[PDB]
Amino acid sequence: GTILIDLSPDDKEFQSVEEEMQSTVREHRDGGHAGGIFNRYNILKIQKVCNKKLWERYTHRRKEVSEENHNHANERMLFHGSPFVNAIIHKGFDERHAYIGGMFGAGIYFAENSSKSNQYVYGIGGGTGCPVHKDRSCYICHRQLLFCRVTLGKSFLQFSAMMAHSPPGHHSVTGRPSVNGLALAEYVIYRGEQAYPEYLITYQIMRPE
Numbered sequence: 001g002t003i004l005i006d007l008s009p010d011d012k013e014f015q016s017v018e019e020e021m022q023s024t025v026r027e028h029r030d031g032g033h034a035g036g037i038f039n040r041y042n043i044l045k046i047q048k049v050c051n052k053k054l055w056e057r058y059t060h061r062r063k064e065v066s067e068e069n070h071n072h073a074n075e076r077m078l079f080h081g082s083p084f085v086n087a088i089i090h091k092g093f094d095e096r097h098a099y100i101g102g103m104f105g106a107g108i109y110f111a112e113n114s115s116k117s118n119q120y121v122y123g124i125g126g127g128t129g130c131p132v133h134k135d136r137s138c139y140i141c142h143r144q145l146l147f148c149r150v151t152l153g154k155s156f157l158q159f160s161a162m163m164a165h166s167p168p169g170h171h172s173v174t175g176r177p178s179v180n181g182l183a184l185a186e187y188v189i190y191r192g193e194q195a196y197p198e199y200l201i202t203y204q205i206m207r208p209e
């Protein structure tokens with residue numbers, strides 16, 4: 001049911017998505033261990049993900065959440081990194097895309113920092129890095145992130161020192177770093193239908209000069 005529509009680098013939509021990727025890179029406290037060493041990306045392709053059934057699943061849950069939260073879906077655009085991008089874009093988010101051992105519970109994780117999501121592209125903590133070179137900082141191999149539409153509803157605020165159910169009365173969790181004042185938030189959802197993978201971004205990390 002999924003088709004992928006290539007966006008032109010001249011299209012304003014491509015440019016707004018690239019800008020959100022590039023502008024939300026930060027330094028990581030592991031010195032690049034998980035995601036590699038880089039300050040910016042080479043964006044190779046941005047594709048719009050189109051799937052009527054997955055979209056309608058998303059908008060149906062969005063209306064439910066909105067009705068439970070003073071008519072406010074609290075919808076965001078957020079990054080998601082995973083070796084299972086190919087299955088997500090075809091079949092949607094589900095429990096197999098849950099990070100069972102994450103800090104904010106067994107759910108599906110999203111990030112404001114593209115570079116946080118990049119740490120998960122090859123597995124938890126970057127796994128063993130790219131398939132070809134076993135390099136977590138591979139500058140050659142192509143990586144993929146999703147830039148997703150996510151319904152947060154009433155989000156439980158969990159300050160952090162950096163499938164389950166939402167905390168009662170809530171629709172998501174906000175993991176808000178309280179020590180590193182330049183790290184942006186992460187969010188966790190517990191129903192796959194509260195996210196739609198809008199864009200598939202193909203990229204390489206770039207070796208700093």
Ligand SMILES: [Zn+2]
Binds near residue numbers: 135140
């Ligand atoms: Zn590689």
